[PDB]
Amino acid sequence: EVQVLVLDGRGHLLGRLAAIVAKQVLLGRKVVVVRCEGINISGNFYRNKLKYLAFLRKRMNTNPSRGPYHFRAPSRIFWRTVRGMLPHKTKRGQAALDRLKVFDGIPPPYDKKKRMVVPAALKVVRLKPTRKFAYLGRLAHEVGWKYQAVTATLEEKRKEKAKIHYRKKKQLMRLRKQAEKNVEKKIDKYTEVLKTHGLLV
Amino acid sequence: MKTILSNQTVDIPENVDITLKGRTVIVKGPRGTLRRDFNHINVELSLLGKKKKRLRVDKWWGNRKELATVRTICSHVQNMIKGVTLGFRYKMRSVYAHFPINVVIQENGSLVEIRNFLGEKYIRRVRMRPGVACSVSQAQKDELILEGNDIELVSNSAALIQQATTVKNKDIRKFLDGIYVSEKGTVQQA
Amino acid sequence: KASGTLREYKVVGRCLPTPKCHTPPLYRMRIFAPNHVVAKSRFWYFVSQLKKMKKSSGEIVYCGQVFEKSPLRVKNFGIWLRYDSRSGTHNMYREYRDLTTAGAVTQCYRDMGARHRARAHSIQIMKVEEIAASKCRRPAVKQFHDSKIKFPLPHRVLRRQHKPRFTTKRPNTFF
Amino acid sequence: VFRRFVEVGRVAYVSFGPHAGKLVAIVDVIDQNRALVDGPCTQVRRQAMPFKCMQLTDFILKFPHSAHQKYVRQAWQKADINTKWAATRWAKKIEARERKAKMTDFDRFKVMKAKKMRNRIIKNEVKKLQKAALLKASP
RNA sequence: CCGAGUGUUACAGCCCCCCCGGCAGCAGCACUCGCCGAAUCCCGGGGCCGAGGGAGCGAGACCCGUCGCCGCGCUCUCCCCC
RNA sequence: UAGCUGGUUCCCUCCGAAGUUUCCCUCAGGAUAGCUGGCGCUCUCGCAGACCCGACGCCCGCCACGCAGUUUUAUCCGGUAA
RNA sequence: GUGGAAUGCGAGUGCCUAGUGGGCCACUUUUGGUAAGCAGAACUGGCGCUGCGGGAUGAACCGAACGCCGGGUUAAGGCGC
RNA sequence: CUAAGGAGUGUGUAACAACUCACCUGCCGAAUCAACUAGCCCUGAAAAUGGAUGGCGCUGGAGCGUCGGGCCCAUACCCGG
RNA sequence: CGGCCAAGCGUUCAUAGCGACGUCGCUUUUUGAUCCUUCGAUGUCGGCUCUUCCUAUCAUUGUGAAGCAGAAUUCACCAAGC
RNA sequence: CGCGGAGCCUCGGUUGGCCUCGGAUAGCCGGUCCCGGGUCCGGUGCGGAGUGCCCUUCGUCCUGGGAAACGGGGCGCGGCC
């Protein structure tokens, strides 16, 4: 297993996804998290905004250019939660944290690869539906992220190129199903062997 | 305590033919059409009849707080049905002690402007919601007559122009001036 | 006294025969306990509070387990208890539905700890009775008294959240 | 929404626990979580089960609540549940899923050769069907 | 076809008492709920380890203590069977 | 001169504290008894019967003294808690 | 001599003798004080003299006391990262 | 002199100021009201470098209560050198 | 420096503003109380200069209350930007 | 520009691929007749399924029968997008 692990960020809770990622990165396993604006945080929006604004006040008052670096993109907010779950003062955790690539939106190395989903970190699995939650993309916008408008215009452009891919992929799927009815007197021998051993219900 | 089932049905007249796209009620009547989604509430909506067309809504294992959202959905659906057959109409009087409040309606009932409130020079300009048309009455001397399909837009537009005429830094037990909602009626009085 | 799942016991005791009372009266209690070592010592706890009887001047004549006389019929159980709070002590009447009697009492110990933070040493079960459906008081029990009971399983949450852990498809919850 | 309901006579499919894989019938309901439950013809004696173990089917038997064993047995046997099951697609998916698991090293070889041939014909046929759909010359 | 009444088995069933039950199984291989083994035995798998070094009461030991205790099998009887 | 500071040089092995009593122009010290170590000594059980081997005297029954931050059984004592 | 309750244990005795005579903490009882990480007692254990596991960190808490190692299993405490 | 009724709660009162509560049998026709009590949560809840369930974080729980099965390792226990 | 209770004050009227007899807290700019750290030394009051922080808000922005007609004023809230 | 060759030096990991809908979750997916829709037909413990799918590697020679014949192979050239 030498490939990378591509996780869609949308619908996942922030710290449930982060403990999943941080244990994989320490076990080898290159992993890319794309679409970090879709990451959710439980609790209502105003509550989670206050916890970020309370973080924005911790600065070294002698020289705040040395202080806590308050990263404001959703990809770099997620990158610090998984860093907090890593032993990043050692060489092992620094060599971990560069097996992790985080992205806002889905850049053109990873837009043509199929994304994975971690069900133990999803909002529809881990929250009761009558609980309030927030979005990492919205919350980063009110704390100073410059680019949710340009990232939204590039995600709607990616999706309409992806609709065209799907309805052509699905157009081949009904030609393959059309073929299986054309050739069935010459593959009835092989569809009996597959049906005997648990393939082809 | 979580109640196994709490339902409430809504009668639909023959003028209106509502549909259900999941938890979105599209009510369509003679005065136009309306649309709200209730996808912040976990209920099941279902049309029942074939000749009378009731609308039920069920909750299934709700606690006390969840059990309150059932009759609110029924009340919002009934204000949709009243809104597309009768429609909503708010008459609001302008109360003044000395300085006559001059309201003149700007472009096609979408903007009102209020000139002389407590004898001052700043001109209030308050925009209606999309769909609400305001007017100056002819039945009385000074009441606004604003009307529309959706109740939360007609009522919001009366609330904007009532909070536009607030007295500041004075006692408001004298100085009772402003425009206040006088009645909440309907068009096409049945 | 901890818990874990309770059993009913029929514990019978009597004072040691002095040369004053040659045959002392046999007393019995019904005592819910994890096992019979704990059951014999709840006996002397309660019987010291009632009769002037300690376990030094006494003997457990019989201590046996009561089995449920109809463990397949669904029953309604009235429970009278008495428990100590952070403030003074209080009386209660609770109700449950269970197949076994000690199942209903176990269900009460979990529930008194849940709603009241009552630890098991603070609770004294003083009478437990099977109630007819007509005599029930608690509306959380009585809503199941319906010959046409019908309800769906609305929002099924995924339980196998790590088999698989990384997957390509998002879970369905409507079933 | 909500076609399948927990009720008396509803046939469920036990998904995990010790009785995993057995059809069973809901006899009575307890306290929102558990159900009195009996499989007379599937070797599950009458007992209590949590609803999270069981998965509802489309089959409903007709008997009143808390009947004895013999009245759910004979309601099972007429309108035969054991043969309506193993005719649905859902019991066929289970049957296929375990016979893929009990597939030896030689049967994986015979499937490998068969599927490699079977995908040659189908792939050859879709080359012809999409070059014949390519023969279109209309404005 | 659902809902509400009605009342006592009817075109379902449930509870109790018997005047008495019969059979099977039996803490069940129908994973409903125990405690055990002089009332208990058999077989297998994984792991770590090999410390010590003249044990012969018998021949008068000789290439060479396969020796003590313990548990067994055969032969110094005879017959039969495969 | 200093009842006061500071320093006081190799290794392993075994044993292992006290800041409390009483007296002192005694209160940053000593004497005193406790607590520690060392050196022993006086006895006891006895060693155990070459490999062996529970035994070898008188139907029973018995297996040395002493000792203890302990209980039991007797029996006194006390004026706290309530 | 039936060695006169149970249980455990080898005991007795002498000489010489160093260091110490600033202690501190905790449960329960307790005195002065509004109290104090305060001052003063009783009882036992501890720290001082003592590492190790746990309480993120810590003289004193909880578990358990230490020759140099292998295997196994626990205690208190834990088991998202 | 009623089908049940003010020497007033009720239009704050030197005013015949003046309006229909109280008590109802038909309407609306099924349960409801009150006083307590104690769980969690909230208000009560204000200090100075920027900051602390240890941190990240966590809300079908990684919170609180009562519980089960597994499991993790001390120089402790066990077997061995 | 705040809270709770409510006899009273407030022409009437407990609670606009108050608040006796009680009682519950917070804070560490006071001083007591203590003696843990420093006596082989931590330069010891104030002013001057200069920065930052706190809020228990004097003013200013946005509000709520009055025994708020206007004016002035008092009481609270968000708030330490200036 | 070549793999064009010849050898070295040094750093090591690794042991088949997955080439893409958007989302919903108190609902989804897939086909279809009439103006991206309405109809209609299916599926739904997802089988048009990541609990999945695709590639499969002993090499050859004799030799047949199927699949094929619109094919295979070229770091083939040339052009286009």
Ligand SMILES: [Mg+2]
């Ligand atoms: Mg900036």
Ligand SMILES: [Mg+2]
């Ligand atoms: Mg003013």
Ligand SMILES: [Mg+2]
């Ligand atoms: Mg001195």
Ligand SMILES: [Mg+2]
């Ligand atoms: Mg000194």
Ligand SMILES: [Mg+2]
């Ligand atoms: Mg005395």
Ligand SMILES: [Mg+2]
């Ligand atoms: Mg006393």
Ligand SMILES: [Mg+2]
């Ligand atoms: Mg010392």
Ligand SMILES: [Mg+2]
């Ligand atoms: Mg202890």
Ligand SMILES: [Mg+2]
């Ligand atoms: Mg007064």
Ligand SMILES: [Mg+2]
């Ligand atoms: Mg002191």
Ligand SMILES: [Mg+2]
């Ligand atoms: Mg100096």
Ligand SMILES: [Mg+2]
């Ligand atoms: Mg200095």
Ligand SMILES: [Mg+2]
């Ligand atoms: Mg403030």
